[PDB]
Design an enzyme around this catalytic site. Structure first.
Site, PDB file in Angstrom:
ATOM      1  N   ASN A 185      55.674  10.544  37.505  1.00  0.00           N
ATOM      2  CA  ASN A 185      56.441  11.800  37.362  1.00  0.00           C
ATOM      3  C   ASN A 185      57.628  11.688  36.397  1.00  0.00           C
ATOM      4  O   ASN A 185      58.476  12.578  36.389  1.00  0.00           O
ATOM      5  CB  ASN A 185      56.929  12.318  38.719  1.00  0.00           C
ATOM      6  CG  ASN A 185      55.830  12.404  39.742  1.00  0.00           C
ATOM      7  OD1 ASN A 185      55.948  11.880  40.862  1.00  0.00           O
ATOM      8  ND2 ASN A 185      54.727  13.033  39.362  1.00  0.00           N
ATOM      9  N   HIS A 187      60.127   9.566  36.416  1.00  0.00           N
ATOM     10  CA  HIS A 187      61.349   9.138  37.086  1.00  0.00           C
ATOM     11  C   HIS A 187      61.379   7.595  37.079  1.00  0.00           C
ATOM     12  O   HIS A 187      60.316   6.968  37.144  1.00  0.00           O
ATOM     13  CB  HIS A 187      61.338   9.650  38.533  1.00  0.00           C
ATOM     14  CG  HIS A 187      61.683  11.107  38.648  1.00  0.00           C
ATOM     15  ND1 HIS A 187      62.983  11.527  38.856  1.00  0.00           N
ATOM     16  CD2 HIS A 187      60.883  12.200  38.540  1.00  0.00           C
ATOM     17  CE1 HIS A 187      62.937  12.855  38.888  1.00  0.00           C
ATOM     18  NE2 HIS A 187      61.697  13.307  38.695  1.00  0.00           N
ATOM     19  N   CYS A 222      69.019   6.870  38.274  1.00  0.00           N
ATOM     20  CA  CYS A 222      69.331   6.581  36.872  1.00  0.00           C
ATOM     21  C   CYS A 222      68.365   7.494  36.096  1.00  0.00           C
ATOM     22  O   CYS A 222      67.149   7.443  36.344  1.00  0.00           O
ATOM     23  CB  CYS A 222      69.090   5.112  36.523  1.00  0.00           C
ATOM     24  SG  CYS A 222      69.147   4.759  34.737  1.00  0.00           S
TER      25      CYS A 222
END
Ligand SMILES: Clc1cccc2[nH]cnc12
Ligand SMILES: Clc1cccc2[nH]cnc12
Lengths: 264, 263
Positions: A185, A187, A222
């Site tokens: 995704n 991330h 992050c």
């Protein structure tokens, strides 16, 4: 891999790969963490998922709040490790996923892990207590009697982690994710934060000790365009450290953790 | 995994893992490259090795000079990919390892790769032509008739790669290895350089295209304490020229090319 006879846990075997091991020719803690993630994913898939019908409708997702891993023996290159995983609700706070790692040949427990997950709206990133309608959909896939990987009373998985105060004893600066650090995704993968925490451990420790315990709190994500500083201070035959990951600029905290190392 | 009936090649199946896939839910080229390395290692282990008795005594090792990978279909998460690998000497220049990737269900070839390896003293890092006594020890594990993953004469795997001239069209600077990027001997894993090359490809390309071909030359190793800049210029289907070089003095570590096709 397969769900066990009662359908309430999942087991899978893995052959340790050549690129998965460190200097001791045994799997790194990041390889172990990747294997925990894989068995967790295969468990969700086997039971129909890891969001429910109601969660997808409400744009809700599960997010890790804490990861705690204890390794007694790291599996060697070519060895087979068997991992069993299960979930259990903890009221409306969230859910816990636990794991037990075993030597496939001897049947001896070589490691154990626990993680605490919270529900969050995917878009607003606002946390929330688990609703009863969402809870009900998950209950049939979890054991009803408590089953803990860390049953002990004063156990390490539940200890509060303090905030490291400057100046840190050691630091690794300017760490940034590459595309390999991202999940499907886009991330940053949770295991990348474990690697970043360990970047500030001095080489001498890595050479003379083995990592026994790692507890990590996840406070903020992050982003793909963020830069991180990894900070470590010794707090202690056993060495213990306090860790802090924070954004390079303003110093916004992304993670805090502790590690325990024993002499080889 | 297992050696095939004739004992001259090795086959192994892999189930694509959740953390091994990109945004298309298919394996990345770095996951593919890791799987090629794994099947290569299991092949060496199955035949007794990755150095011979003579190489260990003379402190010699095999080092990659060039990697060339062509992927037609990337395997999806949960799919099973079967990979067959074999080696062949190329006179005293060095050795070639080839691979064929297949869809386990359909039996269709989904990818292919070739690599050229040279002999080097691990202490002095000086290159050496193989010899006769070392060559003889390896010959019994390779097919004798030529077997090429890229049979076509003067194909993409053999094209010379030019040096990218400044200013680059795109760049990613300050790239550094972490402990996860190291192998069991504390050297940067060859797959890390593929990742670093791809860091300077613009996001728009990654979103609209799929990587079909990547050829990479290895000139110098990035040390655990080195910092790298990844440079890319469009030369065109989209084609790019790539250059990895040390952040400071600009010493070249790799050069390569990629070919991408619209999704
Ligand atoms: Cl993915 C999955 C499998 C079984 C039980 C679960 N509870 C929350 N998520 C679960
Ligand atoms: Cl590792 C390995 C296996 C089979 C053949 C080989 N030739 C050079 N290295 C080889």
């Amino acid at each position: 891999g397969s769900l066990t006879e009662d359908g309430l846990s999942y087991k899978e075997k893995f052959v340790v790969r050549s690129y998965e091991v460190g200097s001791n020719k045994t799997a790194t803690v990041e390889t172990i963490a990747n294997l925990l993630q894989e068995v967790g994913c295969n468990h969700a898939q086997s039971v129909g998922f890891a969001t429910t019908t109601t969660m997808r409708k409400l744009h809700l997702i599960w997010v890790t709040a804490r990861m705690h891993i204890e390794i007694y023996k790291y599996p060697a290159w070519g060895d087979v490790v068997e991992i069993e995983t299960w979930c259990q609700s903890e009221g409306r706070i969230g859910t816990r996923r636990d794991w037990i790692l075993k030597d496939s040949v001897t049947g001896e427990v070589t490691g154990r892990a626990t993680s605490k997950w919270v529900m969050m709206n995917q878009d607003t990133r606002r946390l929330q207590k688990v609703s009863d309608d969402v809870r009900d959909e998950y209950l049939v896939f979890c054991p009803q009697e408590p089953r803990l990987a860390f049953p002990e009373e004063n156990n390490r998985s539940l200890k509060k982690i303090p905030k490291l105060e400057d100046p840190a004893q050691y630091s690794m600066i300017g760490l940034k994710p590459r595309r390999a650090d991202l999940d499907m995704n886009q991330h940053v993968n949770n295991v990348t934060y474990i690697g970043w925490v360990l970047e500030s451990i001095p080489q001498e420790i890595v050479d003379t000790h083995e990592l026994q315990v790692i507890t990590l709190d996840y406070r903020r994500e992050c982003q793909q365009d963020d830069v991180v500083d990894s900070l470590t201070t010794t707090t202690s035959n056993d060495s213990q450290f306090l860790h802090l990951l924070r954004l390079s600029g303003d110093g916004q905290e992304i993670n805090r953790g502790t590690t325990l190392w024993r002499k080889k």
